[PDB]
Amino acid sequence: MIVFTDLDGTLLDERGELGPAREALERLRALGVPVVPVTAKTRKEVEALGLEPPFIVENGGGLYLPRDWPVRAGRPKGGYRVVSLAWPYRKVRARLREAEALAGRPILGYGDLTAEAVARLTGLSREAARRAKAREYDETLVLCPEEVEAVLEALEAVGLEWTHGGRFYHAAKGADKGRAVARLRALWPDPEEARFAVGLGDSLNDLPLFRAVDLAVYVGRGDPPEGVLATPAPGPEGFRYAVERYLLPRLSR
Amino acid sequence: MIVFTDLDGTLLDERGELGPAREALERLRALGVPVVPVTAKTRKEVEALGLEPPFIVENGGGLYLPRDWPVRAGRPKGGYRVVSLAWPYRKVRARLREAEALAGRPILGYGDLTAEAVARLTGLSREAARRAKAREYDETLVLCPEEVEAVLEALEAVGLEWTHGGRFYHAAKGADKGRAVARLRALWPDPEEARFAVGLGDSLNDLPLFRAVDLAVYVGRGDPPEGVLATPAPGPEGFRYAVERYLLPRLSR
Numbered sequence: 001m002i003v004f005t006d007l008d009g010t011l012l013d014e015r016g017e018l019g020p021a022r023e024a025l026e027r028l029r030a031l032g033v034p035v036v037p038v039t040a041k042t043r044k045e046v047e048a049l050g051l052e053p054p055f056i057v058e059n060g061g062g063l064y065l066p067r068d069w070p071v072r073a074g075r076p077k078g079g080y081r082v083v084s085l086a087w088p089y090r091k092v093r094a095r096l097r098e099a100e101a102l103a104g105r106p107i108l109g110y111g112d113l114t115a116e117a118v119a120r121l122t123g124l125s126r127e128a129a130r131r132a133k134a135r136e137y138d139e140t141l142v143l144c145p146e147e148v149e150a151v152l153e154a155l156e157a158v159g160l161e162w163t164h165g166g167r168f169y170h171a172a173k174g175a176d177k178g179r180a181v182a183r184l185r186a187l188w189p190d191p192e193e194a195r196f197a198v199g200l201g202d203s204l205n206d207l208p209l210f211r212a213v214d215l216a217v218y219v220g221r222g223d224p225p226e227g228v229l230a231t232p233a234p235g236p237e238g239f240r241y242a243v244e245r246y247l248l249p250r251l252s253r
Numbered sequence: 254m255i256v257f258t259d260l261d262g263t264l265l266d267e268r269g270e271l272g273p274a275r276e277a278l279e280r281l282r283a284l285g286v287p288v289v290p291v292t293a294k295t296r297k298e299v300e301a302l303g304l305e306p307p308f309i310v311e312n313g314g315g316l317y318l319p320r321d322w323p324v325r326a327g328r329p330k331g332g333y334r335v336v337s338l339a340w341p342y343r344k345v346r347a348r349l350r351e352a353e354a355l356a357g358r359p360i361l362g363y364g365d366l367t368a369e370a371v372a373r374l375t376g377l378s379r380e381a382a383r384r385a386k387a388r389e390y391d392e393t394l395v396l397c398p399e400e401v402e403a404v405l406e407a408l409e410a411v412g413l414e415w416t417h418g419g420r421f422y423h424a425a426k427g428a429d430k431g432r433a434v435a436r437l438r439a440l441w442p443d444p445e446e447a448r449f450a451v452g453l454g455d456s457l458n459d460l461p462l463f464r465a466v467d468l469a470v471y472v473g474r475g476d477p478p479e480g481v482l483a484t485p486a487p488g489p490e491g492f493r494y495a496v497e498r499y500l501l502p503r504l505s506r
């Protein structure tokens with residue numbers, strides 16, 4: 001079994017804390033179950049949470065592996081080897097400029113905003129916003145509701161793909177949590193361990209995640225995507241419930 | 254006679270060129286008629302256009318006078334004396350955070366944007382955008398068309414004022430082109446010369462300018478406000494006609 005999990009609103013709360021999920025995560029580790037973050041966050045953000053590779057960043061845009069991963073792939077970067085799946089940021093920002101001209105109105109993203117503004121909009125510290133701005137593949141957009149559809153089609157018009165991370169729309173191309181997961185499983189050292197995958201998420205950008213796993217669990221608010229398991233409570237309480245009710249009993253085998 | 258004039262859309266075309274207004278300006282200067290810019294632009298932008306004081310920046314937020322001005326007012330700053338009429342930008346920005354909390358939606362201004370983003374939205378070069386970002390009083394807002402009214406209501410509810418400069422809304426407190434023109438006329442070294450004021454402009458933020466002068470001329474598009482002259486063509490072509498057909502005859506008598 002491998003557990004692929006979203007971070008904010010799934011494994012972490014609004015404080016960015018594990019809360020009730022901490023005990024659940026410790027139990028999975030005690031049982032030798034790999035837990036792989038699959039997140040909209042940048043590498044810098046993931047590193048700041050103290051998370052170790054392997055992990056998936058920017059909605060599936062990049063797959064980070066330990067420098068010494070048994071199965072060769074990617075490019076050496078310090079204590080990392082990196083695999084790229086989606087288009088590069090500065091190029092995405094280029095299609096956005098094209099979409100802007102098509103839509104006849106500004107389309108703003110994190111790239112257009114100062115760290116101070118990003119911090120204000122997200123409630124992060126300035127340092128944390130600097131990390132959130134350090135994007136390699138995916139752009140986080142700051143759209144107003146009425147233009148949303150207008151902008152989204154304009155995005156779709158110029159061949160960009162969009163998703164929604166729970167609070168913000170994102171623009172990218174080739175960045176897909178399900179695609180990233182599929183690739184990581186294909187690159188797993190122990191094919192037997194990767195044979196059964198679990199996916200936990202809370203937002204639209206986790207739909208691809210759910211479709212790439214064998215047991216999907218939705219811990220978001222409202223109704224879960226079709227066929228996906230739900231939990232009585234959202235977020236970390238959901239994570240904990242999912243581990244206790246759904247995962248632990250299967251591992252007793 | 255003092256000629257108070259807006260810059261963009263009045264004296265300058267959409268490319269920032271004088272166009273047909275150049276000979277008109279030269280004629281005024283050759284005849285010793287003071288021409289005083291009264292603009293939404295910052296002091297840095299005005300300087301980059303090669304304009305010497307006196308001039309009025311940021312929608313009336315500040316009056317910049319030659320330091321050797323015979324009527325000592327305001328405070329010395331390098332080669333100028335500055336009369337501050339409006340809240341400082343830092344105070345406006347802080348109050349904008351409150352309007353934003355009230356509105357429940359981001360309210361972005363130039364202060365939130367990179368020079369690169371401001372350049373893109375205005376068609377300015379990056380260097381020009383840096384100058385437009387160097388604001389001392391007034392904030393330029395970048396609002397969703399659909400959110401404008403809610404935002405303007407929020408600004409007012411938290412004690413800020415707003416205007417529109419032709420393309421963008423602005424937020425400030427105490428910046429008014431009319432108040433600024435009145436103050437400058439009151440500070441003029443030669444009261445006789447200040448007794449008759451001409452005002453030329455093209456946008457909402459110029460309506461106070463028209464009220465503060467004795468001969469008002471609108472060179473924007475569509476019909477002029479009540480009590481304000483129109484010209485056959487808008488922009489610098491209107492400035493030229495105004496100088497040739499309205500001002501130079503007044504002067505000759």
Ligand SMILES: O=C(O)[C@@H](CO)O[C@H]1O[C@H](CO)[C@@H](O)[C@H](O)[C@@H]1O
Binds near residue numbers: 045
């Ligand atoms: O998509 C969103 O709604 C959130 C949650 O996934 O992610 C964005 O916003 C987060 C902060 O709220 C950042 O940490 C991420 O990098 C990203 O920019």
Ligand SMILES: O=C(O)[C@@H](CO)O[C@H]1O[C@H](CO)[C@@H](O)[C@H](O)[C@@H]1O
Binds near residue numbers: 261
């Ligand atoms: O208000 C507007 O519609 C324009 C018209 O001059 O002024 C803003 O926009 C201009 C660029 O278009 C800047 O030069 C000014 O500083 C200001 O930010």
Ligand SMILES: [Mg+2]
Binds near residue numbers: 009010166202203
């Ligand atoms: Mg999430």
Ligand SMILES: [Mg+2]
Binds near residue numbers: 260454455
């Ligand atoms: Mg104008």
